[PDB]
Enzyme design. Structure first.
Site, PDB file in Angstrom:
ATOM      1  CD  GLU A   1      -2.757  -1.141   2.505  1.00  9.07           C
ATOM      2  OE1 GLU A   1      -2.913  -0.029   3.131  1.00  9.07           O
ATOM      3  OE2 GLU A   1      -3.447  -2.124   2.709  1.00  9.07           O
TER       4      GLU A   1
ATOM      5  CD  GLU B   1      -5.015  -4.654   4.684  1.00  7.73           C
ATOM      6  OE1 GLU B   1      -5.669  -3.961   3.843  1.00  7.73           O
ATOM      7  OE2 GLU B   1      -4.261  -4.155   5.700  1.00  7.73           O
TER       8      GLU B   1
HETATM    9  C1  LIG Z   1      -4.254  -2.682   5.871  1.00  6.01           C
HETATM   10  C2  LIG Z   1      -5.228  -2.432   6.956  1.00  6.01           C
HETATM   11 BR1  LIG Z   1      -7.072  -2.539   6.347  1.00  6.01          BR
HETATM   12  C3  LIG Z   1      -4.947  -2.121   8.179  1.00  6.01           C
HETATM   13  C4  LIG Z   1      -5.994  -1.650   9.135  1.00  6.01           C
HETATM   14  O1  LIG Z   1      -6.020  -0.221   9.132  1.00  6.01           O
HETATM   15  C5  LIG Z   1      -3.508  -1.956   8.625  1.00  6.01           C
HETATM   16  O2  LIG Z   1      -3.306  -2.400   9.950  1.00  6.01           O
HETATM   17  C6  LIG Z   1      -2.539  -2.628   7.659  1.00  6.01           C
HETATM   18  O3  LIG Z   1      -1.149  -2.296   7.985  1.00  6.01           O
HETATM   19  C7  LIG Z   1      -2.849  -2.207   6.239  1.00  6.01           C
HETATM   20  O4  LIG Z   1      -1.928  -2.805   5.336  1.00  6.01           O
END
Ligand SMILES: *[C@H]1C(Br)=C(CO)[C@@H](O)[C@H](O)[C@H]1O
EC number: 3.2.1.23
Length: 489
Positions: A206, A387
């Site tokens: 991300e 995820e």
């Molecule tokens: C994806 C998500 Br959804 C969360 C929750 O906010 C994070 O903890 C994680 O690191 C992200 O990659």
């Protein structure tokens, strides 16, 4: 029943910063994120919770217990990262024959000599400790996705407090091509040390969130919290180049698949007049990025070009999904609407009457089918759901959330999309960035005082799914919306 292919794997995803610290000698003080969450001014402002990651769930020490529980649950895949900071805590010398003022990074030369040179600087104790964790993971029959980057940078590459204060004379993180250069060598170095254990690689998790919350969504309290559209664009340009150079770096040492993990929303029209708004949102938030690293297509100085050093740098797509974004067409473009998707009240209902999580995120599983099929139809690259999960300490909504989203992956496979696994966020509760420990995403509940793990009922439901490779007849009713009448409005 909804049966998955025999090759499909159920498992979990986890981040080093969020999960590692909490046990003896686990502490890693050498990241931007560590400094950022300990910063007195960030705490007084409420940008960070005041919770500290060294009080975390202690995977660094307690990994055999995590993996014991995953194996009891029937899980067959894991996605984890190494922390760059643990491996290279100390500054590396600036290379000769590399000019920082060049915008483009089209090549990073890596060979055996450069990698042996890097050995001199590496923390051997961290490398050996990671090798111990990964061998234990493989000994349970877990297929292993290794990710190179899940948000913290070494402090010697990013001092986020200096940047927050509007001082750009120091280490500036992704705003600097130095970070691009070093990230490519790092990624090659890790593949050179770990390739015997790894099944597939991801460069990054991300990178769109890192830049978007760091330089625009500054109320999130993500580093470096410097409000600038211009710097958010420079971040995303450097990220694309860092991904391409890391891919080339890994491929110089390994023949295994190299992908990326990216944060997706399902863009949905407020009314039947907002279909063009959805396409404009998908272009702005998804396709411009993937068109760059797959097709080499990028806009530089208002011109649509093809960079040969960017084209073809992707073997698979990691889909990270939790909710929708509702959009409508405006005279000048489009806007996202409050009261839907991630912009809801916590422990309430959305404007559509759908239940929201402890984090204020709307229940919208159909979006995951939308995102998987859209990716498939544009690129025909295989995918993992890397995820998907919910903040739910009580476990009220998580059984519905889990079975509903797994159903939507089954639907995408049935429509012809090549999706090879589903990795829940997360096995256990962890440190939720600026929010700290109150947001609990685990199938397993963590007592942070003792580091003991407990099975939430959703962990028993996931064991049914993973051990049968199916949503079984017995649990199919959980493919539904959590009833709202007994929940808070
Ligand atoms: C994806 C998500 Br959804 C969360 C929750 O906010 C994070 O903890 C994680 O690191 C992200 O990659």
């Amino acid at each position: 029943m909804y049966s998955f292919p025999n090759s499909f794997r159920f498992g979990w995803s986890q981040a080093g910063f969020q999960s590692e610290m909490g046990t003896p000698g686990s502490e890693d003080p050498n990241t931007d994120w560590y400094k950022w969450v300990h910063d007195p001014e960030n705490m007084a402002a409420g940008l960070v919770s005041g919770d500290l990651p060294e009080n975390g769930p202690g995977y660094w020490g307690n990994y055999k217990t995590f993996h014991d529980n995953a194996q009891k649950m029937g899980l067959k895949i894991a996605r984890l990262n190494v922390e760059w900071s643990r491996i290279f805590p100390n500054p590396l010398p600036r290379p000769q024959n590399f000019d920082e003022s060049k915008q483009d990074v089209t090549e990073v030369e890596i060979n055996e000599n450069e990698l042996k040179r890097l050995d001199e600087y590496a923390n051997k104790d961290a490398l050996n400790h990671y090798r111990e964790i990964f061998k234990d993971l493989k000994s349970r029959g877990l297929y292993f996705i290794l990710n190179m980057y899940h948000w913290p940078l070494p402090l010697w590459l990013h001092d986020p407090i200096r940047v927050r204060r509007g001082d750009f004379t120091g280490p500036s993180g992704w705003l600097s091509t130095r970070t691009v250069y070093e990230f490519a060598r790092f990624s090659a170095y890790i593949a050179w040390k770990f390739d015997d254990l790894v099944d597939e690689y991801s460069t990054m998790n991300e990178p769109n969130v890192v830049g978007g919350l760091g330089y625009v969504g500054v109320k999130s309290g993500f580093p470096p919290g410097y409000l600038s559209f211009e710097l958010s664009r420079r971040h995303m340009y450097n990220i694309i180049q860092a991904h391409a150079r890391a891919y080339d770096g890994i491929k110089s040492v390994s023949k295994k698949p190299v992908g990326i993990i990216y944060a997706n929303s399902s863009f949905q029209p407020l009314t039947d007049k907002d279909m063009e708004a959805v396409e404009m949102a998908e272009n702005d938030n998804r396709w411009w990025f993937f068109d760059a690293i797959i097709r080499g297509e990028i806009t530089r100085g208002n011109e649509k070009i093809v960079r040969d050093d960017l084209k073809g740098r992707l073997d698979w797509i990691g889909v990270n999904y939790y909710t929708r974004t509702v959009v409508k067409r405006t005279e000048k473009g489009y806007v996202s609407l409050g009261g839907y998707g991630h912009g809801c009240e916590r422990n309430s209902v959305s404007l559509a009457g759908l239940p929201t999580s402890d984090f204020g995120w709307e229940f919208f599983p159909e979006g995951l089918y939308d995102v998987l099929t859209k990716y498939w139809n544009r690129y025909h690259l295989y995918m993992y759901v890397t995820e998907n999960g919910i903040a739910d300490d009580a476990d009220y909504q998580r059984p519905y959330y889990l079975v509903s989203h797994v159903y939507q992956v089954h639907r995408a496979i049935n429509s012809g999309a090549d999706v090879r696994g589903y990795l829940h966020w997360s096995l256990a509760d962890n440190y939720e960035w600026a929010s700290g420990f109150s947001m609990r995403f685990g199938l397993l509940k963590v007592d942070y005082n003792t580091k003991r793990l407990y099975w939430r009922p959703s962990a028993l439901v996931y064991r049914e799914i993973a051990t049968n490779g199916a949503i079984t007849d017995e649990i199919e009713h959980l493919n539904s919306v959590p009833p709202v009448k007994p929940l808070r409005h």
